[PDB]
Amino acid sequence: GGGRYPFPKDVISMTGGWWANPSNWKLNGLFATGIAVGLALWVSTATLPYTRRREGITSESDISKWNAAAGVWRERHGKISTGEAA
């Protein structure tokens, strides 16, 4: 290629090295694309049940009941809201 220099051929990195472009890269790229598409499909399909929207999951009646129970607890324990001590 252009702008190239000698390099030690016995240096082995998990990345390429110096201008890595082996003469089988279409087959290996086919393998890598297959593994990548499969991994992406697996992760998406398996993470579908762990997704949710922010809103519309809990009825506001549940929210009303929980806030009312909170008030019940707060006056059972004899507590006043923030700022009322003045």
Ligand X SMILES: CCCCCCCCCCCC(=O)OC[C@H](COP(=O)(O)OCC[N+](C)(C)C)OC(=O)CCCCCCCCCCC
For residues 29 and 36, give the distance between their C-alpha atoms in angstroms, rounded to a whole number. 10
For residues 61 and 69, give the distance between their C-alpha atoms in angstroms, rounded to a whole number. 12
By beta-carbon proximity to ligand X, the closer residue of 11 and 48 is: 11
Residues at the site binding other proteins, with contacts judged by CB under 8 A: 1-4, 7-8, 11-29, 31-33, 35-36, 39-41, 43-45, 47-48, 50-58, 60, 62-63, 65-74, 77, 79-84, 86
| Cβ pair 19, 4 in contact under 8 A | yes
Long-range contacts of 4-7 (CB under 8 A, 24+ apart): none
Per-residue contact flags (x/-) with ligand X for residues 2 to 41, judged by CB under 6 A: ---------x-xxxxx------------------------
Residues in touch with ligand X (CB under 6 A)? 11, 13-17
